Design an enzyme around this catalytic site. Structure first.
Site, PDB file in Angstrom:
ATOM      1  CG  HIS A  56      -2.249  -8.910  -3.668  1.00 29.84           C
ATOM      2  ND1 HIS A  56      -1.345  -8.451  -2.731  1.00 29.84           N
ATOM      3  CD2 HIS A  56      -1.891  -8.338  -4.843  1.00 29.84           C
ATOM      4  CE1 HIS A  56      -0.486  -7.637  -3.314  1.00 29.84           C
ATOM      5  NE2 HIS A  56      -0.795  -7.550  -4.597  1.00 29.84           N
ATOM      6  CG  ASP A  72      -1.384  -9.591   0.454  1.00 28.57           C
ATOM      7  OD1 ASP A  72      -1.467 -10.657  -0.194  1.00 28.57           O
ATOM      8  OD2 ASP A  72      -1.132  -8.487  -0.073  1.00 28.57           O
ATOM      9  CB  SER A 127       2.444  -7.091  -5.036  1.00 24.74           C
ATOM     10  OG  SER A 127       1.701  -5.882  -5.028  1.00 24.74           O
TER      11      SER A 127
END
Length: 238
Positions: free
Chosen positions: A44, A93, A188
């Protein structure tokens, strides 16, 4: 990282900071060195990214301040996103960044071992999440790499905290019932590293969560061991 502290320089040598140069240079996501030409990160992180040409990978960094226009970096030759990836909350992801040049390992930058399928039974008790992400939902990228020790939670327990989602076995969660420590925006793609038998393993990849460090809202990570076959296949020359 919420509720963490400043890391010691070189303490997480596999941690990299992935920058985008568009429009102007800035930290985009975290990532982990898993091979001399490979960074494992979150899929992502590449939303709106049309080319690898605007990406820069910096290794051996503690403070973002160390990064200047004259600082060396690794270009990205290819972005490999799991073909089943749609969005963080749905899983898959995970992404690989094939570097244009190889990383010369040193005390400040070396690869982290991937988990073994035979360790899925092993219970990790010393896991840490790291990054330059927000210190709070509404914050900004931090200068110094932060670290926080967070216990893993069972998927059954995690599912109970996210009744609107489907927490699959391809995900792994970590958090405190009372909240207070967790990854946040900007973390992330970074690692969830657990030390087991004096050896660090890349157990998860920071993916998502409901806000940051909230009570009864464990952070959700990509369960790396479920992708070792995928990583092997994608990191093969041809």
């Amino acid at each position: 990282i919420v509720g963490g502290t400043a890391s010691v320089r070189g303490e997480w040598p596999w941690q990299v900071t992935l920058h985008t140069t568009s429009p102007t240079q800035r930290h985009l996501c975290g990532g982990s060195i898993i091979g001399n030409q490979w960074i494992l990160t979150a899929a992502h992180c590449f939303y709106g990214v049309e080319s690898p040409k605007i990406l820069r990978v910096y290794s051996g960094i503690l403070n973002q301040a160390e990064i200047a226009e004259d600082t060396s970096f690794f270009g990205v030759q290819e972005i490999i996103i799991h073909d089943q990836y749609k969005m963080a909350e749905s899983g898959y992801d995970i992404a690989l960044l094939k570097l244009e040049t190889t990383v010369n390992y040193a005390d400040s930058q070396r690869p982290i071992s991937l988990p073994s399928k035979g360790d899925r039974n092993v219970i990790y008790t010393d896991c840490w999440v790291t990054g330059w992400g927000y210190r709070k939902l509404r914050d900004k990228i931090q200068n110094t790499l932060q670290k926080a020790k967070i216990p893993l939670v069972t998927n059954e327990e995690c599912q109970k905290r996210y009744r609107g989602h489907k927490i699959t076995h391809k995900m792994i969660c970590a958090g405190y019932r009372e909240g207070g420590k967790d990854a946040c925006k900007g973390d992330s793609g970074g690692p969830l590293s657990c030390k087991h038998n004096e050896v660090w393993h890349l157990v998860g990849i920071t993916s998502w969560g409901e806000g940051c460090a909230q009570r009864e809202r464990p952070g959700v990570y990509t369960n790396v061991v479920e992708y070792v076959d995928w990583i092997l296949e994608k990191t093969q020359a041809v």
